[PDB]
Write a protein that binds this ligand. Structure first.
Ligand SMILES: [C-]#[N+][C@@H]1[C@@H]2c3c([nH]c4ccccc34)C(C)(C)[C@H]2CC[C@@]1(C)CC
Ligand SMILES: O=C(O)CCC(=O)C(=O)O
Ligand SMILES: [Cl-]
Ligand SMILES: [Fe+2]
Length: 280
């Protein structure tokens, strides 16, 4: 039901309004972009993490043990669930950027390459957002899914309703936010991005007595009947760029000894629509 383009990284400049067309015009819902990073680069970065020679990335690993099976471990603080002051977020974000820059060894640089893609798909300048007093946001977090683990169903636009987003809302236009991620390592089986046709609907959610009741309905609505879905398994160095702000989605259980490792985040238009911000 959902329409995705499947293109190679070298063809991106032939789609100079792809981000506009996904968010504003809504003519299609996502993109696989093949070979944004070389496989050598992906394996180099995977080894750094595995070895511990990771530019200090393991010093900002959040295991999320208090939460259950339905959640990845995350290198760097994800903005989702943070307090609106973002002090811990800004500290870990500064560490992430430096550590990630070192691991990629400018071959190519993660930030430069990801920004190159987003520029090519929009014709606009691209920036990592900056805090109230100049503090850097993080462009991405690295998500680690071990065997048996998954990422529970969720929708991206709920972020706008969180305290964490109070600063970003001053900078962002309130159109849909996209999700992006590149696998560093893929598992033997499972760990697929499942995108459903069930859409974000805060109007419906407020009619319930609380969000607890609304997500319980959404969960039973999605498993498994009244919603079409599509699954994706990008390879190492492929970007999956899609409207996760609008569409409910999840990552299926990882099967096998090899963990799923992705580097990713989100993007959206600036208030003025003359710029793209990306972050995690
Ligand atoms: C995993 N993960 C992220 C989100 C996340 C969730 N629950 C968490 C609990 C504690 C820390 C993070 C999360 C949900 C299921 C909303 C996850 C959505 C996607 C993330 C990888 C990043 C925003
Ligand atoms: O696999 C990942 O890194 C995140 C998947 C996801 O929920 C998203 O891209 O929004
Ligand atoms: Cl999302
Ligand atoms: Fe998501």
């Amino acid at each position: 039901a959902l329409h995705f383009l499947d293109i190679n990284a070298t063809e991106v400049k032939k789609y100079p309004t792809a981000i506009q067309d996904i968010i504003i015009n809504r003519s299609f819902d996502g993109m696989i972009i093949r070979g944004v990073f070389p496989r050598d680069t992906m394996e180099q970065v995977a080894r750094c993490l595995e070895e511990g020679n990771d530019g200090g990335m393991k010093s900002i690993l959040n295991k999320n043990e208090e939460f259950g099976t339905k959640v990845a471990q995350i290198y760097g603080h994800a903005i989702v669930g943070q307090s609106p002051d973002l002090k811990d977020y800004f500290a870990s974000s500064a560490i992430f950027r430096q550590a990630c820059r070192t691991m990629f060894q400018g071959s190519p640089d993660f930030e430069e390459q990801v920004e190159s893609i987003f520029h090519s798909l929009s014709g606009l300048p691209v920036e990592i957002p900056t805090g109230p007093e100049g503090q850097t946001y993080t462009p991405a977090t690295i998500r680690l899914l071990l065997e048996g683990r998954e990422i529970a169903v969720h929708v991206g636009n709920d972020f706008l309703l969180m305290p964490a987003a109070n600063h970003l809302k001053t900078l962002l236009d309130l159109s849909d936010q996209l999700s992006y991620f590149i696998p560093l390592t893929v598992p033997e089986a499972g760990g697929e991005l499942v995108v459903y046709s069930l859409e974000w609907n805060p109007q419906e959610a407020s009619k319930y007595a609380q969000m607890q009741e609304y997500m319980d309905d959404v969960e039973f609505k999605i498993k498994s009947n009244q919603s079409q879905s599509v699954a994706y398994a990008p390879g190492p160095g492929d970007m999956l760029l899609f409207n996760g702000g609008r569409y409910y989605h999840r990552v299926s259980e990882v099967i096998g000894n090899s963990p799923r490792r992705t580097i990713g985040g989100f993007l959206a238009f600036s208030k003025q629509r003359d710029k793209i911000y990306y972050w995690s």
